[PDB]
Each structure stands twice: as C-alpha cells, then as structure tokens.
Design a protein around this nucleic acid. Structure first.
Ligand SMILES: Cc1ccnc2c1NC(=O)c1cccnc1N2C1CC1
Lengths: 543, 410
DNA sequence: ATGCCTATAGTTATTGTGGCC
RNA sequence: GGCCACAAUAACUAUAGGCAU
C-alpha cells in the first residue's frame, strides 16, 4: 500500500534469532544531529515509528554486523571480476550514477521488524522514539543481492528492444557502451533515464555526466585503450620485513600488463617464518631482478580491447629457473593481457611438463574472461613433445599449437636407453643409512673386480642411494649400465630435475650429457639376486 | 505428489559454478527459454543459497546441444530416499545374456511434478562471458535429469507400464537405472532388433518418447608371460621384479628358484640357461595367471574402486576392485581407430565403457582413478561426454610398477 | 602398528593487491 | 575485524616407495 516494485520475502536462520545487544553509552553531541536525519527519512517513507511491541534492538554507530550473522546466506553478487582486456571496444561510453539506490527498493514487511533500531536517549534514561527500516538498510548482507536482481528485471525489456547496445551493472554504478555515433548515443541514455525514473531512481543530467576517463578497480579506462594506475615505490633503503612482501604484491599487480616481471628471488627472502620485525638485508641475487623491473615501470603502456572477429594468440617465454611468462595478443606488438607461472611446491616439475601446466592456466583463464580457447605458440620442438608424453604416466592434450622459435630455447638434456648396451661395464647400485647419528655408506660392485666404499656424515637413506649413482658414473667409461634396487632413485633419472632442490642430482645430470648411452634397470630389494647381495653386505657392515 | 525430505543435520548442496565456453553458454539459454514456456523451469531471486553445477554436452543421434546437470553433491545427501525408502530391485541374470540394447528414457521424467519444498534445492546458475550478466537462475518444477530420486518416484508408474511387456516375454529380463534403460535378450541378432522396436512402439502409445553391447564377450583375458628362446640376465631381472609385485595379489607365484640362477656379479649380455627347477616353476606360474584366483567376491556394502592406467602408443588398461590388490573384473581398450583420437578422448570413452558395464553386472557408480590433472580434466571432458549419468572420480598418482605389469595382458 | 623421509594428487591458513560493510 | 575476486608463501590428508622400532 506504500512500497512499489513488489517486495521479496526474506527470512532469518532457524538456528538463532536477531540481535539482542543493549544500547551504547550516551554522547549528547552526536544525538542532536541525528534527530533531523530521522525526521527527514520518515517524511519520505524510509523509516516508521513503532511502539514497545518490538523486542529487537540495533545499536547506532548504524552497525549491522550482529544482524548479518543471523540473516540467511545469499548467493554471491559477482562471479569473477571483469578484466578490461576481455571487454569489447566501444565508440562512446557513458556512466550513470543511481541516486537513492537502497532508498527506492523496499524491504519485506516480515523482515522490517528485525531491522528496528533505538536512538540514544537525551537525559535520565528515557525510552525515546523507536524506528524501523522499511527499505534496504545501509550495511546489510542481502542489500547488494536484491538490488542487482531488481535492476535486472527493470532492464529486462530494454535489452530486447536494443540488442546493439551493451549495458553493465556494478553495485550502484551502471556502464553503457555502444559503437554508435556521439549524437545517437546521447539520445539512448536520455531514454534510459526515463525508464529508471518510472520506478523511482535518480539520474544525473547531461551537464553532470562524467568524462570518458574512468577509474574502476584501480584501472584507468578509455574508449579505445586501457592502462593501470602508476605505482610509486620508495627508492632509498629497504625497510622492515613486511615491506619486502609488499614489493612482491606490487609486482603481482603489475604482472597483468607488464610482461617482464620477476618475483622468484624476492620470495626466497620470505622463507623465514614467525616474525614481527625481522628486517631483511638486501642481497646480490635478490636485487638483480629488482633493478630490471623498475626500468619497465618507467615507460607507460596500454592494453587493447577484445575483438570477436580476430583469434587470440599466446606465446611462452622463459626468463628464469622454474618461472614462465606469457602474453596474449590478437595483433603484433599490441598486447591484451600478460600472465605468469612462478609457484614451485618444492620438488622437480620438469621444464616440458611445467610449460604444459602454464598453458592449462591460460586455457582456464581464457574461458572465464574471453570465452574461447586461444592459439598457443610453444618454444618446444614437435619431436621433443611426442617423446616425453608417450613414456610418461600422466596424459594431457593440446588442441591447437604452432612451433615458433624463441631466443630462450628449452631443450632436453638426456634420454635413457630401452635396450641394454653390449660390451659395457655393469654397475650395481645399493646404499644404506642409519636414523641415529645420521650416518650412511655408498658403494658399487662391478663384474671386473674394482670397488670403492666411502663414509658420509649427516645424511638420509634417500641421499645415500643417490650418492652411489654419482660415484658409479664418475669412475666409468662412455657406456654405463646402472642397476638400482630403490624405486625412489628410479623416478628421478627418468624425469628431468630443474629447481632449487636436487643440487646433488645436478652433478649427475651434467655427467649424463657427457656420456653417449646410459642404461637403467630396477631390481627387487632383499631377495637373493646375484650382484645385488654383494653391495648390500658392504653398506650394512657398520650399520 | 510425494513430499521429499533431506537427511537430518546435512544442509543443501553448495558447489561453485565451473565456467563454460562462449558457444556452450548461448546453447544453454536456447534450451532454458523453451523449457520455461512449456512449464519445466521457473526464475527465482537471490534469496536462494543452493547452487548446482551445469554443463553442456553434444548428441550423436539428435545432433543437438543437450543440457547436463551434475547432481553428485546432492546424490550423497539424497541417498536415503532412493535406497532406504524406495529401493530398486536388481536381478542376478542381467550380466549373462547375448545382446544388450541401451535406450534413453530421461524424457519421460518431465511429466511428473516435483515437491514444492524441494524446488529450491534444484536451483542452478548459468555461467557468462567476462561476468557481464549477474547470472540467470532457474529451478526445477519437475523431475530433473541426473538425479537418483527421479526413478524412485517414477518406479510406481514404470512397473505398471512394463507389466504387459514382462507378461509377454518372461525370459527377457528388464532393468531400469537413472535415465538409461537396459534390456537383455537371448534371441538372435536378427530378432533382437525386432523386439526393441516393439518395446519402443509401446512408449509412443503412452505419451512420452546402432548402439549395442555384448555381455557374453566380457570374458576375463589371462595375463601371459613373454616367450623367449634365449634368456639373458636383463630379461630375468625385469621378470623377477614384476612377479614380486604380483606376489601379494597371487600367492601361488614364487620367485625363489629364479633368483638362485644368478650367482655373483654378472653382465646383462651374458646368457644364463634355465635349470630343471627353473623351467618347472616358470611354466607353473602361467597356469595360476590363467585360472581365476580364489577369494574374489562381491560386497554391496563396500564402495567400488576403478583405476585406469596410461601405457602409451594408444593403449589403456583398467582394474575394477573393492579391496586393494584383489581384482574382480579386468579389461583393456586400445584405440578407437577410424577418425580422430587423442589423450582425453581415449580416456573419456574408457570411463563411459566401464560405467555401462558396471550397471549391467553390479549396478553402482565406481570411483574412477584418472592419470590427469583436475584443471585439465574438468575442462575437456564435456566435449566428448554423451551419457547423462555422471560418476564420481578422483585424481591420484600412477605407479610405474602397475604400468609394467598389465601391459602383457592379451 | 607408529614415527620419520621422499615423491605423485588434493585440501587449508596466511599474507598481499583491488574493492566493500 | 568480517565478506568478494585474483595471486604468492607455510601446514595437513589418499597413493607409491623407503628407513627405524
Ligand atoms: C567498467 C566497465 C564494466 C563493464 N564493461 C565495460 C566497462 N567499461 C569500460 O570502460 C569500457 C570502456 C571502453 C569500451 N568498453 C567498455 N566496457 C563492455 C561495455 C564495455
């Protein structure tokens, strides 16, 4: 009888009721100003006077933090933030700011009694005048959910009448963009203003309209291009511990537009856990990539909008160890959006495999923003691509990819032989270590008769088996046959280790490139095989 | 109508929506608009917190885009309604037949309306390009496709219409599962097509509207050991390691005599002749591999587990087991030679092959172990997906020991 | 059997950037 | 302080192998 646009029924959680917190102590200096605000909202039709029938109370700051916990769960307003690179290019863009947004869209009668608040008393603890929200209150969890759903119903017939125009809604602000001329675009907004005025929404006039440069989510928007806001960093001394991580976050936000962003060496300093004020000093390797990052930030660059007619092209580059950077572009030189793949969990991930993992990150991101799979350009050869995945256990598929050579080329180091080498010396690999005091031995027994036994300090069982392979390839010719008993050592040689970990393996990898043919075989441990038992007795002699 | 109640304590499903391609998004709107006008789905506000994942699949017979809704989260909570309250009887003489014909009966569920209180739980959100639209919401007014509670309510009507069909053919055993109909016939292949046509004509009389499988050809193929005239040290070392891993599966195989052949350090090039004890043991091990192992039994209380392994050069093998290292059903699919094959397509067709076999023999969806990433699988599985039933799958490591053992299977 | 190591999958807690109440 | 989107870093569970008791 008073509220338009048909109210949507909202109910509380069956577990607990609304707020029951008492009123805050009096201020007197702030109460007098609040009297004029409550009287103005009462005349318009936002709040109404109620008696002592309402038991619920809300403190005036007005805080709705206690109410939100009692209110039922609502579906999320936005599913992923829109990126300026995936947007369509428009000739004229005009924004509309909604005046009295939550004041127009009302609340259901059943929920109106739960949003009742009490104004602090004047003197002698008086009851005062009670008020309850009839419309959507400021600071409620369900406020942005209902308002967005109501606006969709308003602009439902408007989109069908004009399919050529694209309208977007964001909380209170509405963005209108079209490929039409400046004269025709101005008429469409005037018709859009009259459509919103019917329900009761205030829109600014032609003189109060905002200029083509817009500021949204920290991005500077233009009708033809888009650019990020310039980030200013202090250039004197490296301060505290958390500010080092802040520089990584600034580079993280710069990774979406700047292709040359390195963060690997900066994250190495953040290895120290449990610290309030640590103050990390600068090193040679960490500041080396920090110097080149500042040079790219000096020159201003702009991104390009998405075009449906042209296909998306992506290319993979290598800038460091275990770090990949990619750029998506439709036209040469003009980039749309750049990305990165820098996370390393600890163990080896393989350069060929991590490259495919980087592609999958682009593919999934392209579905959300662009909506279609882009054409990839890999720095790996077609011959190397087919050899790796056929022998590997994990299966992956790339639909469309082209071979394009890049300055930082990635090549395979070594490949294990399938058939045993004839006339070559046979090496048996077996090692054992103790948990107490941390001591282990490594040795190898050959068919000729030569053998070497060494002792190691501060080592695990996984490292002692790894050390025995290194010594077997050290005192050998060109063609080496390696027989190992451990399953752990078998998996490392088959794969290609390239990370911060596996420093001991890097000595073996360098030797494997020098050798022409290397054979590897696996045998069961502790059974009674000739050649394996002889090595086992030597390592477990003192252990 | 019948009221549907959820399991006490557990709340409704809340799963995040997976993004879809631009071609699939516009395809979903076309179906949703047609269903809204007929009276199948209705729009709801933002007050609904429950979300259901939705995907788009292509059809072969109708060559059109079909709407697929995943109810795997809801099925775990609504298991009391479809088993305890209204259970589906499963015959033992369904796995033993000559020819099984698969027919889609999912279109018949759009007639029976859903409960008013349960309508809010079947709400789903449609993904959009760059999140331009907030998201168009729809709730199911009738029985949805892919839900296990739909056949339970329809069971009272399904038994009545199949009553004259069962009376005419007592020897032919019929079974209903989810949205697919499975009919097993013991007649000839020329007479099998006539029997299905008569059953399909009965459906048109009621109101609502070559693919064949061989259940007799699912014989367990024995794993055979490679035959060699001259055995070398390298050949023995690989043979001992593979059979030692299978010692926990098969207790009959012993590697005691094989290890005694090698004495001291020797080169792989050297040829070692087998003794009388070595030849007797190796030949005996082949007999244990051919004969089915004792201790294989089906238990409905325990969940079924399936593991698929990649071999290479267009070769795939799978093992169906309830308990670790205790196989129940073994089989392998090589390559679908004819048009186009890839790493995803060969795996997608493999899962659908096991799922169809699981219904006829047992009647439960197994846990699929896939040698693929979660981000890779959840993007390209919809491209080659045809079946309306979606099984539960997990992603784990594939050992090198299990790969080198099942490659010798004929 | 449990505690202690490595690798393959996944999950969470923490911080940061951009916003909001 | 909580909520939303995206990233970097530390911990915890299934599988496979290993060591110690
Ligand atoms: C903030 C925002 C939100 C949603 N879309 C857009 C934008 N705004 C852009 O500024 C914008 C600028 C130029 C062209 N299209 C744009 N766009 C499709 C309508 C442009």
């Amino acid at each position: 009888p008073i509220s338009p646009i048909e109210t949507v029924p909202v109910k509380l959680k069956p577990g607990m009721d609304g707020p029951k917190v008492k009123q805050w102590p009096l201020t007197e200096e702030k109460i007098k100003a609040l009297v004029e605000i409550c009287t103005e909202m009462e005349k318009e039709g936002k709040i109404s006077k109620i008696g002592p029938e309402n038991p619920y109370n809300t403190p005036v700051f007005v805080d709705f933090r206690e109410l939100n916990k009692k209110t039922q769960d609502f579906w999320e307003v936005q599913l992923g933030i829109p990126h300026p690179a995936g947007l369509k290019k428009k000739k004229s863009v005009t924004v509309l700011d909604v005046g009295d947004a939550y004041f127009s869209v009302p609340l259901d009668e059943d929920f109106r009694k739960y949003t009742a608040f009490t104004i602090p008393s004047i003197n002698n603890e008086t009851p005062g005048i009670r008020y309850q929200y009839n419309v959507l209150p400021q600071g409620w969890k369900g406020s942005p959910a209902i308002f967005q759903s109501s606006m969709t119903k308003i602009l439902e017939p408007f989109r069908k009448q004009n399919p050529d125009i694209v309208i977007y809604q964001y909380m209170d602000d509405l963005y209108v963009g079209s490929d039409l001329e400046i004269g025709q675009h101005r008429t469409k907004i005037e018709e859009l203003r009259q459509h919103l005025l019917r329900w009761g929404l205030t829109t600014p006039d032609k003189k109060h309209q905002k200029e083509p440069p817009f500021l949204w989510m920290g991005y500077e928007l233009h009708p033809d291009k888009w650019t990020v806001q310039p980030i200013v960093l202090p250039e004197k001394d490296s301060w505290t511990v958390n500010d080092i991580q802040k520089l990584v976050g600034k580079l993280n936000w710069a990774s979406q537009i700047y292709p040359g962003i390195k963060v690997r060496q900066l994250c190495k300093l953040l290895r120290g856990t449990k610290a309030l004020t640590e103050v990390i000093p600068l090193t040679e390797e960490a500041e080396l990539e920090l110097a080149e990052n500042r040079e790219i930030l000096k020159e201003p660059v702009h991104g390009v909008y998405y075009d449906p007619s042209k296909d998306l092209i992506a290319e993979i580059q290598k800038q460091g160890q275990g770090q990949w950077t990619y750029q998506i572009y439709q036209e040469p030189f003009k980039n749309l959006k750049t990305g990165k793949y820098a996370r390393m969990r600890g163990a080896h991930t393989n350069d060929v495999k991590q490259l495919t993992e980087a592609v999958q990150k682009i593919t999934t991101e392209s579905i959300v923003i662009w909506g279609k799979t882009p054409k990839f350009k890999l720095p790996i050869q077609k011959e190397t691509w087919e050899t790796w995945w056929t022998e590997y256990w994990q299966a992956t598929w790339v639909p469309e990819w082209e071979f394009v050579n890049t300055p930082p080329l990635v090549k395979l180091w070594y490949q294990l032989e399938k058939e045993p080498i004839v006339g070559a010396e046979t090496f048996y690999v077996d090692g054992a270590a103790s948990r107490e005091t941390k001591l282990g031995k490594a040795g190898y027994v050959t068919n000729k008769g030569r053998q070497k036994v060494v002792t190691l300090t501060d080592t695990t069982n996984q490292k002692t088996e790894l050390q025995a392979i290194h010594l077997a390839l050290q005192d050998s010719g060109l063609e080496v046959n390696i027989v190992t008993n451990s399953q752990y050592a078998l998996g490392i040689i088959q794969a290609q280790p390239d990370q911060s970990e596996s420093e001991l393996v890097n000595q073996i990898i360098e030797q494997l490139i020098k050798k022409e043919k290397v054979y590897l075989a696996w045998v069961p441990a502790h059974k009674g095989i000739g050649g394996n038992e002889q090595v086992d007795k030597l390592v477990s002699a003192g252990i | 109508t019948v009221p549907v109640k959820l399991k006490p304590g557990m709340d409704g499903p809340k799963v995040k929506q997976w993004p879809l391609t631009e071609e699939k998004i516009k395809a979903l709107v076309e179906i949703c608009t047609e269903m809204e006008k007929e009276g199948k789905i209705s729009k709801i506000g933002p007050e609904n917190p429950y979300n259901t994942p939705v995907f788009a699949i292509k059809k072969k017979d109708g060559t059109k885009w079909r709407k697929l809704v995943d109810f795997r989260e809801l099925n775990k909570k609504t298991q009391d309604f479809w088993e305890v309250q209204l259970g589906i009887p499963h015959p033992a003489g369904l796995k033993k037949k000559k020819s099984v014909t698969v027919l889609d009966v999912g279109d018949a569920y759009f007639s029976v309306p859903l409960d008013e209180d349960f309508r809010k739980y079947t709400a789903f959100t449609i993904p959009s390009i760059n999140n331009e639209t907030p998201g168009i919401r729809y709730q199911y007014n009738v029985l949805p496709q892919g839900w296990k509670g739909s056949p339970a309510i329809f069971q009272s009507s399904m038994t009545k219409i199949l009553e004259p069909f069962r009376k005419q053919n007592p020897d032919i055993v019929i079974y209903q599962y989810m949205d697919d109909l499975y009919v097993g016939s013991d007649l000839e292949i020329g007479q099998h097509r006539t029997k299905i046509e008569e059953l399909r004509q009965h459906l048109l009389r009621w109101g609502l509207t070559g693919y064949e499988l061989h259940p007799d050809k699912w014989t367990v193929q024995p794993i055979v050991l490679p035959e060699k005239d001259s055995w070398t040290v390298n050949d023995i070392q690989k043979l001992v390691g593979k059979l030692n891993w299978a010692s926990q599966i098969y207790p009959g195989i012993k590697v005691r005599q094989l290890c005694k052949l090698l004495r001291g350090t020797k080169a792989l090039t050297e040829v070692i002749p087998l003794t009388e004890e070595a030849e007797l043991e190796l030949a005996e091990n082949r007999e244990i591999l051919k004969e089915p192992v004792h201790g294989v039994y089906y238990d409905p209380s325990k969940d079924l587990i399936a593991e698929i392994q990649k071999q290479g050069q267009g070769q795939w093998t799978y093992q169906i087991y309830q308990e670790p290292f205790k196989n129940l059903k073994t089989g392998k699919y090589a390559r679908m030679r004819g048009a186009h094959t890839n790493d995803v397509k060969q795996l997608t067709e493999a899962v659908q092959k096991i799922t169809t076999e699981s219904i006829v023999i047992w009647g439960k969806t197994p846990k699929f172990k896939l040698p693929i990433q979660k981000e890779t699988w959840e993007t390209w599985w919809t491209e080659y997906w045809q079946a309306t039933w979606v099984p539960e799958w997990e992603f784990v490591n594939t050992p090198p020991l299990v790969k080198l053992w099942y490659q010798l299977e004929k």
